[PDB]
Design a protein around this motif. Structure first.
Motif, PDB file in Angstrom:
ATOM      1  N   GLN A   1      -5.741  -1.214 -10.589  1.00 55.74           N
ATOM      2  CA  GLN A   1      -5.008  -0.907 -10.731  1.00 55.74           C
ATOM      3  C   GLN A   1      -4.653   0.485 -12.114  1.00 55.74           C
ATOM      4  OE1 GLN A   1      -1.718  -3.579 -12.549  1.00 55.74           O
ATOM      5  NE2 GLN A   1      -0.299  -2.193 -13.372  1.00 55.74           N
ATOM      6  N   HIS A   2      -4.339   1.777 -11.740  1.00 59.44           N
ATOM      7  CA  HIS A   2      -5.566   2.434 -12.626  1.00 59.44           C
ATOM      8  C   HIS A   2      -3.722   3.472 -13.718  1.00 59.44           C
ATOM      9  CE1 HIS A   2      -9.321   3.185 -12.008  1.00 59.44           C
ATOM     10  NE2 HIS A   2      -9.459   3.363 -11.152  1.00 59.44           N
ATOM     11  N   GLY A   3      -2.856   3.078 -12.841  1.00 62.43           N
ATOM     12  CA  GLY A   3      -1.123   3.001 -13.509  1.00 62.43           C
ATOM     13  C   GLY A   3      -0.858   1.893 -14.071  1.00 62.43           C
ATOM     14  N   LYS A   4       0.690   2.103 -15.039  1.00 62.56           N
ATOM     15  CA  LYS A   4       1.476   1.068 -15.657  1.00 62.56           C
ATOM     16  C   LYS A   4       2.011  -0.117 -14.646  1.00 62.56           C
ATOM     17  CE  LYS A   4       0.446   2.811 -19.103  1.00 62.56           C
ATOM     18  NZ  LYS A   4       1.697   3.747 -20.142  1.00 62.56           N
ATOM     19  N   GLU A   5       2.150   0.057 -13.543  1.00 66.21           N
ATOM     20  CA  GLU A   5       3.421  -0.373 -12.719  1.00 66.21           C
ATOM     21  C   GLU A   5       2.262  -1.474 -11.775  1.00 66.21           C
ATOM     22  OE1 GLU A   5       5.976   3.446 -11.290  1.00 66.21           O
ATOM     23  OE2 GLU A   5       4.933   2.109  -9.170  1.00 66.21           O
ATOM     24  N   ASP A   6       2.449  -2.727 -11.851  1.00 63.68           N
ATOM     25  CA  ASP A   6       2.527  -3.529 -11.077  1.00 63.68           C
ATOM     26  C   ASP A   6       2.871  -3.793  -9.522  1.00 63.68           C
ATOM     27  OD1 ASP A   6       2.429  -5.238 -13.280  1.00 63.68           O
ATOM     28  OD2 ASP A   6       4.013  -7.158 -12.816  1.00 63.68           O
ATOM     29  N   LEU A   7       1.623  -4.475  -8.830  1.00 59.60           N
ATOM     30  CA  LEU A   7       1.323  -4.123  -7.120  1.00 59.60           C
ATOM     31  C   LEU A   7       2.422  -4.661  -6.482  1.00 59.60           C
ATOM     32  CD1 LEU A   7      -0.281  -3.493  -5.101  1.00 59.60           C
ATOM     33  CD2 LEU A   7      -1.609  -5.365  -5.206  1.00 59.60           C
ATOM     34  N   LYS A   8       2.764  -4.005  -5.826  1.00 60.56           N
ATOM     35  CA  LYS A   8       4.373  -4.539  -4.722  1.00 60.56           C
ATOM     36  C   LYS A   8       3.947  -3.796  -3.412  1.00 60.56           C
ATOM     37  CE  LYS A   8       8.423  -1.997  -5.395  1.00 60.56           C
ATOM     38  NZ  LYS A   8       8.604  -1.056  -6.689  1.00 60.56           N
ATOM     39  N   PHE A   9       4.328  -4.055  -2.409  1.00 64.65           N
ATOM     40  CA  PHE A   9       4.471  -3.514  -0.839  1.00 64.65           C
ATOM     41  C   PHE A   9       5.997  -4.036  -0.382  1.00 64.65           C
ATOM     42  CE2 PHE A   9      -0.116  -4.517  -1.906  1.00 64.65           C
ATOM     43  CZ  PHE A   9      -0.440  -2.704  -0.863  1.00 64.65           C
ATOM     44  N   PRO A  10       6.127  -2.992   0.009  1.00 67.89           N
ATOM     45  CA  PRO A  10       7.561  -3.229   0.523  1.00 67.89           C
ATOM     46  C   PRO A  10       7.382  -4.236   2.339  1.00 67.89           C
ATOM     47  CG  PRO A  10       6.905  -1.409   1.319  1.00 67.89           C
ATOM     48  CD  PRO A  10       6.055  -1.562   1.008  1.00 67.89           C
ATOM     49  N   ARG A  11       8.379  -4.850   2.402  1.00 67.22           N
ATOM     50  CA  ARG A  11       8.169  -6.336   3.311  1.00 67.22           C
ATOM     51  C   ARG A  11       7.396  -5.760   4.597  1.00 67.22           C
ATOM     52  NH1 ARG A  11       9.030  -6.049   7.042  1.00 67.22           N
ATOM     53  NH2 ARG A  11      11.317  -4.630   8.303  1.00 67.22           N
ATOM     54  N   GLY A  12       6.064  -6.009   5.233  1.00 65.49           N
ATOM     55  CA  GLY A  12       5.398  -5.882   6.585  1.00 65.49           C
ATOM     56  C   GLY A  12       5.206  -4.769   5.935  1.00 65.49           C
ATOM     57  N   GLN A  13       3.714  -5.046   4.655  1.00 59.98           N
ATOM     58  CA  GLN A  13       2.953  -4.061   4.491  1.00 59.98           C
ATOM     59  C   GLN A  13       2.220  -5.202   3.484  1.00 59.98           C
ATOM     60  OE1 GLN A  13       3.997   0.091   3.105  1.00 59.98           O
ATOM     61  NE2 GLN A  13       5.096  -0.029   5.204  1.00 59.98           N
ATOM     62  N   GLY A  14       1.237  -4.086   2.817  1.00 60.99           N
ATOM     63  CA  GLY A  14       0.216  -4.604   2.235  1.00 60.99           C
ATOM     64  C   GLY A  14      -0.900  -5.911   3.359  1.00 60.99           C
ATOM     65  N   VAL A  15      -1.307  -6.378   3.817  1.00 58.26           N
ATOM     66  CA  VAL A  15      -2.003  -7.120   4.153  1.00 58.26           C
ATOM     67  C   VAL A  15      -3.096  -6.468   4.127  1.00 58.26           C
ATOM     68  CG1 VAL A  15      -2.671  -8.987   6.044  1.00 58.26           C
ATOM     69  CG2 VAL A  15      -0.321  -8.996   5.067  1.00 58.26           C
ATOM     70  N   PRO A  16      -4.443  -6.404   3.673  1.00 57.23           N
ATOM     71  CA  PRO A  16      -5.489  -6.044   4.280  1.00 57.23           C
ATOM     72  C   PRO A  16      -6.382  -6.162   6.274  1.00 57.23           C
ATOM     73  CG  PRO A  16      -6.251  -6.976   2.109  1.00 57.23           C
ATOM     74  CD  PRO A  16      -4.924  -8.189   2.894  1.00 57.23           C
ATOM     75  N   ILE A  17      -6.722  -4.965   6.190  1.00 63.56           N
ATOM     76  CA  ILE A  17      -7.685  -5.263   7.670  1.00 63.56           C
ATOM     77  C   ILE A  17      -8.214  -6.204   7.805  1.00 63.56           C
ATOM     78  CG2 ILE A  17      -8.393  -4.139   9.346  1.00 63.56           C
ATOM     79  CD1 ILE A  17      -6.298  -1.675   9.017  1.00 63.56           C
TER      80      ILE A  17
END
Length: 128
Positions: free
Chosen positions: A12-28
């Protein structure tokens, strides 16, 4: 009881916490099946001695662990806790991934974290 993530971290290089839209974000992970595609990211903060002796925060890292594994293996999906955010791919089973588990660095390299094309990352996240 190593409990190392299977994947490299998101920084995280910015100031917002991590989050993903529902359905996204699981690593391949080709070593996993559709039922397995669910888990959480855990924020990993590091502090370093700055250029003036004052301890200072480095950029937080976010590591993915499959549901039912890792430092928060006991949390059920969706549980609220600072530093923990949840992700799940369409069609995943809400069951602990004792069938995937965690990585031992002695005998397995981290998988470079990749997401399918067009994933909505927050501002400030691109990592590795």
């Amino acid at each position: 009881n190593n409990t190392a993530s299977w994947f490299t971290a998101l920084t995280q290089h910015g100031k917002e916490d991590l989050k993903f839209p529902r359905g996204q974000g699981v690593p391949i992970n080709t070593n996993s099946s559709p039922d397995d595609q669910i888990g959480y990211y855990r924020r990993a903060t590091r502090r370093i001695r700055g250029g003036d002796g004052k301890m200072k925060d480095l950029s937080p890292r976010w590591y993915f662990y499959y549901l039912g594994t890792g430092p928060e293996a006991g949390l059920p999906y969706g549980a609220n806790k600072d530093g923990i955010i949840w992700v799940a791919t369409e069609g995943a089973l809400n069951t602990p991934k004792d069938h995937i588990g965690t990585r031992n660095p002695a005998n397995n390299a981290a998988i470079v974290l990749q997401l399918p094309q067009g994933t909505t990352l927050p501002k400030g996240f691109y990592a590795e």
